[PDB]
Structure 1
């Protein structure tokens, strides 16, 4: 009931009762808020409401102080002071951006733009409010009850009337009952639970409604610049493998935090594990939002770092299968690999946070709260995919607004830039360099002469909203007959429904653009499916085509992105 103002830290008993996070607001800032928003309920030890029996006046602008009690204009005593006077709300110990964050529905892009351009304390308020609004929104969808169990990987379901049905993709992990978490894909719905239980008919699955904890630590700690490497001890016997990053590792020891922008295949994993070989005594915590990103870092460490000094932290509510070669849950091992949401309360000499475009300000703050380190290193690429914002429907979110780190990388630029792509054929590197990296990404490989583009709009069908283009899958099928080396290709598309149709017809392994991020394949077959804002997104486009080591076939719908592709044009 007594804390500090979320706008100027001025100690106060006042909290906004109309805010879903009930932030402490000082007399000056509380007034500026209630006089401009629909928010008029003010909370103290006792609420600011009319004390007169059966009176429902709760608006602080319509209330007055009767000695030590509160009353409306109809019930106030002769000697009373309005709670709102001279730019203040009465309380003990006696902003336009805060009003917008506190009242927005988080469905517009301008809401997220503001959540990142605001002050630091408002970035945490925006992050808490957004995350709590994302969870209260989970109470809105309808329950699915089992009607029939077809097999071990398929079932038929009954849906709740009056409440809408949620998107059937691997993104929306349902929580079933206490049989564990369960996922779905499209009347024969394919079921895939984290736990393998012979599902009983009549059982029900409901979405993961978790409670949002408050944020204390900033998204980014205040920057410090040092004259020498601080708290870290370099090697002199440094493997020629990592000699290219020595100057950047030294810059890491001479700053509190450092940003590394690394386009696809420029050596981000290599940079992260080499930093451990450069400061060999340093205790490093490797973190990322996804289990896949943390696992990718584990594969690189297995190759260069002693397997005994490594540990993979796995939480009890195990949703996906993880890295199995390190000792599990040993918080004290020199090298700790763990996802943001499972981080223990520990300290480190260096913290490395990878796949930084996928992080939210909620995640940035959590890392600063659970880990107290001498140095922080943010590795990622603002030209790659951000975390999905489930409430955002109106407008497109730009990279300088993904999180505080991406905002820094897109405005002041990154501290370090890995400029040479070692993975992709030159056709792909030249296209993405011009598309998203301002011609600064250089190709290490020559042109493979296996990068093709075909302009084919086909026919667009929709399974609810995930789009399908059967003629584009047919064009791929025709190409494969004439190109058997492409038999070993991974099929990629912006839609899971397209991928389900392509897996049945082509039999190729399948990946959405979003789930392909971080991975690499010799051959990639990409069908754009539609020319929507989703499939034409340049960050998704950049990710889609930078998955290929040898060859890529792009069946395009957008003339703009087709014309930008510096690939060999095909006909049929």
Structure 2
């Protein structure tokens, strides 16, 4: 019951028993909380409650110190002191934003805005509260019990009456019951056991409810600027491949942390792995939130870094398959490739955090907690997709509120900008350069003359809330017969249910915009499906069209984004 004040540090006995995290609040700060919020339960060694038998007054504003104990106005002795007076709550050693964070339900963008404009101590209170709220919300969904098993990859589900049914995307990972984790895709649902098992009738699935550990470390260790490359030892024999990155590699060494904004295809992986070659004796930990992101950095390491000095860290509760050409779970290899969730307690000369738009402030804190490093490098792009906010239903989360790194990148700019797209036909580079990159992104490739747009609103049907547009798929089917080179195309849409239908009708491989991020394909076919804020999100749109190396066909619903595409228009 003795801790530091989660605003001003001042030690106290006082936590808030109304906050769902139970933060330590100093007397001066615990007052400003309880007199401005529905939050009236103060905890100490024992709860500030009325000690009078049978009395249920718990509100600190209605309570007095009666010698040693606490009483309401109905029970206090003559010589009694109000617990709340003179801007303070009585305690040992004797904030608007804190109040908003403490009380918000996290369904409003403004909640996320505040949690990124506040002080650093509040960003950690914010991130813990939010994750706690996210996890305790999970308990409010209905159970899914197997009616009938059709095949090895399809089944029929019976749902609990009285409680809502959650959306069946890959995002929402269920646990079967302890028969391992399972995901679904929509009267025929596709079932994918992360662990293989001849699915039983009667068996049930419930959502992975994980306990929110406290945070300790800041999102961002305080900045240090050095006059000289600190704690790292450079070569004077650096492969010409990486000669472009050398001045930025020296910036990495002359600062505590650094931020790299690389638009799609500008050589982020190449910069990350090139940093190892420039500082060849430096121990580097390569981390990102997703397995795919860490598996990209592993592929790029395989090509340039000695395979004997590389480990892929795999958590024993292994969900999806990942990189297999490194030594698995050797914490002490010079090069360690690990998702945030799975990072060991260790130290490093450099930490590289990739796909930083996908990072939460919680993730930015856990990294600073598990890795003590001389230098932190934050790589990604705030013009790309953030981590989904399952509670956020009102307002759009701007890039400058994704996390502390994106906030820095969007205010003071990034330390380093990769300014040349080497992946995309110039039509795509010119479009996204203007849309999200303030015309700073340059094309290396020529116009492909294989980038097409078609304005076709079609007809929008919903599988619950996931959108489908059969006519936009039909137009794609017509196009494919006349453009057989596109038969190898990846189909991409903002909606699982659209992808589900496009899979059956077109037979192309299928990807949501959000799962496409980090990947590249020669040809892409994008159907926008709807004109919602989801499908018109400039960040989603940027990722969608920058997956293509050669060609893209965009069937558009939105005039604005359609007109902005510097592509050749088609007809029909």
Shift of 1:349: 0.2
Q: CA deviation at 1:183?
A: 0.3
3-state DSSP class of the match of 1:485?
helix
Give the Cα separation in 1 of the matches to 2:190 and 2:522.
29
Deviations 1:475-529 (A, max 9, x none): 0000000000000000000000000000000000000000000000000000000
Q: Aligned-pair distance for 1:323?
A: 0.2
Unmatched 5+ stretches in structure 1: none
Deviation at 1:420, TM superposition (A): 0.2
Give TM-score scaled by structure 2 length: 1.00
Q: CA deviation at 1:473?
A: 0.1
Q: Report the 3-state secondary structure (helix = DSSP H, G, I; strand = E; otherwise coil) of the residue aligned with 1:184.
A: strand
Encode CA deviations 1:30-88: one digit per residue, 9 max, x unaligned.
00000000000000001000000000000000000000100000000000000001000
Displacement after TM superposition at 1:192 (Å): 0.5
In the alignment, the residues of structure 2 paired with residue 147 and residue 506 of structure 1 have an alpha-carbon distance, to the nearest angstrom, of: 30
Alpha-carbon distance in structure 1 between the residues aligned to 2:17 and 2:25: 10
**Cα distance in 2 for residues equivalent to 1:197 and 1:310:** 33
Alignment partners' CA distance in 2, 1:272 and 1:78? 70
Q: Could you list the runs of 5+ residues in structure 2 that have no partner in the other structure?
A: none
- The structural deviation recorded for 1:539 is 0.1
State the SS of the aligned residue for 1:31. Answer: helix
Question: 1:364-407: per-residue Cα shift (whole Å, max 9, x none)?
Answer: 00000000000000000000000000000000000000000000
> Structure 1 residue 337: deviation in Å?
0.2
Deviation at 1:187, TM superposition (A): 1.0
Equivalent-residue separation in structure 2 for 1:227 and 1:322 (angstroms): 40
Give the distance between the partners of 1:202 and 1:129, measured in 2 at CA: 36
1:519-543 deviation line (CA, Å, top 9, x unaligned): 0000000000000000000000000
Structure 2 CA distance, aligned partners of 1:87 and 1:233? Answer: 55
Does the residue aligned with 1:191 lie in a helix, a strand or coil?
A: strand
Q: How far does residue 332 in structure 1 lie from its aligned partner after superposition?
A: 0.4
Q: Please tell me the root mean square deviation across aligned C-alpha atoms, in Å.
A: 0.3
CA distance in 1, matches of 2:179, 2:378: 37
Structure 1 residue 275, shift from structure 2 partner: 0.2
Task: Say if 2:138 is the partner of 1:138.
Answer: yes
CA distance in 2: counterparts of 1:532 and 1:463, whole angstroms: 15
By how many angstroms is 1:188 displaced? Answer: 1.1
Matching residue of 2:247: 247
After superposition, give the CA deviation of every residue in 1:239-295 in whole Å (9 maximum; x if it has no partner). 000000000000000000000000000000000000000000000000000000000
SS in 2 for 1:394: coil
Corresponding residue number in structure 1 for 2:106: 106
SS of equivalent residue, structure 1 residue 534:
helix
Cα separation, 2, equivalents of 1:98 and 1:337:
36
1:199, distance to aligned residue in structure 2 (A): 1.2
Q: CA deviation at 1:353?
A: 0.1
Partners of 2:490 and 2:264 in 1: how far apart? 17
Please name the residue that 1:216 is paired with: 216
Q: Deviations along 1:303-342, whole A, 9 cap, x unmatched?
A: 0000000000000100000100000000000000000000
The DSSP-based 3-state class of the residue aligned with 2:146 is strand
Deviation of the 1:418 alpha carbon: 0.1
Q: CA deviation at 1:147?
A: 1.0
Deviations 1:72-119 (A, max 9, x none): 000000000000010000000000000000000000000000000000
* TM-superposed deviation, 1:200: 1.2
What SS does the aligned partner of 1:491 have?
strand
When the two structures are aligned, how many residues end up with a matched partner? 572
Shift of 1:194: 0.1
Residue 212 (structure 1) shift: 0.2
C-alpha deviation, 1:166, in angstroms: 0.4
Out of 168-177 and 436-445, give the one that drifted further: 168-177
Distance in structure 2 (CA, Å) of the matches to 1:258 and 1:188: 49
User: 1:471 Cα shift?
Assistant: 0.1
- TM-score normalised by L of structure 1: 1.00
> In 1, Cα distance between the equivalents of 2:10 and 2:485?
68
- What secondary structure does 2:524 align onto? strand
C-alpha distance in 1, partners of 2:130/2:169? 23
Aligned residue for 2:138, secondary structure, equals helix
Describe how 1:269-280 pairs up with structure 2 within 5 A. 269-280=269-280
